Symmetry: C3
Amino acid sequence: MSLIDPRAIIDPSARLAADVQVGPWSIVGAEVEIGEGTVIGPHVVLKGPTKIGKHNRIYQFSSVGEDTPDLKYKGEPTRLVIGDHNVIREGVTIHRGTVQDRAETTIGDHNLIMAYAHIGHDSVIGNHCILVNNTALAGHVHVDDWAILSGYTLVHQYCRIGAHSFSGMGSAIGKDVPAYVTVFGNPAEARSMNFEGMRRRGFSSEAIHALRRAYKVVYRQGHTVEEALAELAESAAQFPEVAVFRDSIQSATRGITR
Amino acid sequence: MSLIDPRAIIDPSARLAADVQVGPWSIVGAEVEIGEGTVIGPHVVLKGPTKIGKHNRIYQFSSVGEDTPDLKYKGEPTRLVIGDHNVIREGVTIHRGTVQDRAETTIGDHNLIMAYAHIGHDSVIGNHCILVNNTALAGHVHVDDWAILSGYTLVHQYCRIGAHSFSGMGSAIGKDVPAYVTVFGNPAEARSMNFEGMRRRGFSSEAIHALRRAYKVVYRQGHTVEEALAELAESAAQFPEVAVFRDSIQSATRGITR
Amino acid sequence: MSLIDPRAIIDPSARLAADVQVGPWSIVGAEVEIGEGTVIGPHVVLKGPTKIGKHNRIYQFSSVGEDTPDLKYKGEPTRLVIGDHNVIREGVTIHRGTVQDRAETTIGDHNLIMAYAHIGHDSVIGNHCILVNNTALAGHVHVDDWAILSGYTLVHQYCRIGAHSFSGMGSAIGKDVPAYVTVFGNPAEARSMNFEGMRRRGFSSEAIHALRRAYKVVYRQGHTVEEALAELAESAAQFPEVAVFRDSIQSATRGITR
Ligand SMILES: N#Cc1ccc(CN(Cc2c[nH]cn2)C(=O)CSc2ccccc2Cl)cc1
Ligand SMILES: N#Cc1ccc(CN(Cc2c[nH]cn2)C(=O)CSc2ccccc2Cl)cc1
Ligand SMILES: N#Cc1ccc(CN(Cc2c[nH]cn2)C(=O)CSc2ccccc2Cl)cc1
Ligand SMILES: [Cl-]
Ligand SMILES: [Cl-]
Ligand SMILES: [Cl-]
Ligand SMILES: [Cl-]
Ligand SMILES: [Cl-]
Ligand SMILES: [Cl-]
C-alpha cells in the first residue's frame, strides 16, 4: 500500500512524480526522471541521464539507461528518453546514446517491448510498436509507428523499420524495411505486406489494394529501385498510405553519381 | 540453513509444503503453491495462480507465472501448473495461460529448461524434455515426452513438437515436428530421425529400423501426407514406436474438404 | 562509500583483494577469489570454485561460476578462471568446467562479453575478444585473440573460433572458423577475411594481400583442405600472419586413414 519500497535505492538527484511506484531492490540512479503514474517493478536498474514519461510499466531484471559497451562510447554524458504508456517486460536492456549520433536513445508512446529485447544506443522507436522477446536493435535503428518485430528479430546498426512493417521470428534485418512490408529469414527478405496491420487500422479497401500494387511495383516487376519510385509517384499522390511506403524506400536509397 | 530466507517476500496467501527452500530477494506471489522439497533460488519471482510440484529447482532471475504481454490476454484469472523434478535455470520466463485456449500453461515432470528459455502462454510440456538455452515457445506449443530443442530454437504458436524429436541450434520451427524427427535451420526442415535418443531409451534394433523406414515413407518417396499415413498403417500396428510417429503426423494434418 | 555493500552476501571462504567492490544483493559463494580493482555490480551471482583477476567489471543479473546443467556433469569440483580487464555485461551466464575435458572454463584478459552472452562449460577465450549480446558457446569452444562474434552468434560444442575471425549476427557456427575469416548465416559460411581487424592491428599491407590470397587458396580455388594446406606452406613461411591462418586450418582436420 506504499509507493516506493523502502528496500529500493533512490539517488537524491533522481526525480519521481509523486504517484510513481518502485518495487523492492530496484535502483533509480542519478539523473533519472520518472513521470506521473509509472510503475517500476522489483529488481530494476535505471541509470541516467534518463527521462521516463507517464504510465510506463517496467518489469523485473531490466537495465534501462546503461552505457552501451561499444568501444565508440567513451563516457560522454548522453541521454535516454522514454515517453508515455510503454510496457517494458522482464530483462529488457535499453542503452543511452553516443555523441557521434544525436547523443539520445528515444522511445515514443504506447510501445510493448517484450522480455530480453535490447534497444541499442541511439535507436529511435516511435509509437505503438511491438518488439517481441529478444528483438535486438544493434544501434541507431529507427522503428516507425505500429511496427511489429517478431521474437528474436535482429536489426543491423542504422536500419529503418518502416511504419506497419513486420518481421517474422528469427529475421536478421541488414537493410531498411519499407513501411507495411513483411520480411523473413537470415538474411531478412521481403515476402508481402502486413494486411492484418492494415485491417486493424481500418484502412480503406482501395488503400489495401493500392499497397498490394505498390508491393508488386517494388518487388515483383524487375524495376530497379529508381524505376519503382518513379512508377509509385501516381499511387503516392492518390493515397497517403502509399506515400508513407514510397517515402520509406526514398529515404533508404540516395546513391552515388554513376 | 533456514528454509525460507527472511530476505524473501512470501504472500500470506501462498501455500508452501513444509521443506521448501526460498532464497533471498525472491518473491512468492499471491495464489502461488509450491510442493515438497522444491528449491527456489535467490532473485526468483513467482506470480500466480500457479501450482509448482515437488523437488523442482528454479534458478535466479526466472519469472514464473507472470501474465503474457500478448494484447489478446485481458487480466483474467488463468493458471500455470508445473509438475515434479523439473530444473528451470537462470532467467527463464514462463507465463500463465489465456482463456481463449484452456486457461493453463502446463509443465510435466523431469524437464530441464535451460537459461533464458521462454515458455509462452498456454504451452503444454510433457516429461523428460530439454529446452536448451534461449529456446522460445511463442504460445499454445505442445512438447511431447523426451523432446530436445537445441539452443535458441524458436517455435511458432500452436505447433506440436513430437515425442523424442530434436531441433538443432537456431531452428525456427513453424509447422509441427513429428515424433523422433530431427529438424534444422530457419525455416526448420526435417533431416533424419533422433536415433541417439532411441538408443538411450533402449529401443529394439527392429524398432529403430522401422522408424528409419517410416521416415523414408513420409519424407523421401514423393508420398503426400495422406498416402504416407496409409502406408504407415502396417508399421504402426507392428511397433508402438512407429504408431507414436504415425499419430504425430495424423494430428497435424486434419485438412479441408477438397 | 563502503567498497562491499552491506546488503551483499560474502562466503567466509571467498577471498577478495582489498579494493574489490561488490554492489547490493550480489552473492560471492564459497571458493570465489576476486582480484585487485575488480567491480561486482548489484544482483550478481558468483559460484565457485572460481578465480577472477584484476580490474574486471561484472554487471547486474550475471551468473558467473554456476554448474553447467548438461547431464554429463555430476557435481565434480570443476573450476572457472577469468583473467584481468574483462567486462561482463548485464545477465551473462558463465559455467564452470566438466571432468571429461580439463575441468576448467577459462577467460583471458581484455575481453568484452555483452548482455545475455553464454560461456558454456570448458570454453577457453583468449584476449581482446568481443562476444556481442546473446552469443552462446555451447561448450568446449576455443576462441582465440581479437575474435569478434556478432550478436546472437551460436557456436556448436568443440568449435575453434580463430584469431581476428569475425561472425555476423545470427551466425550458427557448426565447424571451426579459421583465423581472420568472416562467416555469416545458419549454417555459417565463409565470405571474406576481416581486413578491418588487420587494419586496426597495424598489419603490413603486404600481409593483408597475403591473407587475401590465402583465403582464395582455401575457399575460391577447387582445393581440398589437404591441397590448400600444402599450397599455403610458402605464404606461411613468409608471413607470420598467414602461418596463424595455416595453423587454424591444420588443427581442425586430423582426418582418418582412407
Ligand atoms: N501482442 C502481441 C504480439 C504481436 C505479434 C507477435 C508476433 N508473433 C506472432 C506471429 C508471427 N507470425 C504470425 N504471428 C511472434 O513474434 C511469434 S515468435 C515469439 C512470440 C513470443 C515469444 C517468443 C517468440 Cl520467439 C507476437 C505477439
Ligand atoms: N543435457 C543436455 C543437452 C542435450 C542436448 C543439447 C543440444 N545441444 C548439443 C547438440 C546439438 N547437436 C548435438 N548435440 C545444443 O543445444 C547445442 S546449442 C547450445 C547448447 C548450450 C547452450 C547454448 C547453446 Cl546455443 C544440449 C544439452
Ligand atoms: N565494441 C563493439 C562491437 C564490436 C563489434 C560488433 C559487431 N556488430 C556490429 C557493430 C560494429 N560496430 C558496432 N556494431 C554486431 O554484432 C551487430 S549485431 C548486435 C549488436 C549489439 C547488440 C545486439 C546485436 Cl544483435 C558490435 C559491437
Ligand atoms: Cl489489380
Ligand atoms: Cl504477382
Ligand atoms: Cl490438446
Ligand atoms: Cl531396408
Ligand atoms: Cl532414401
Ligand atoms: Cl594477386
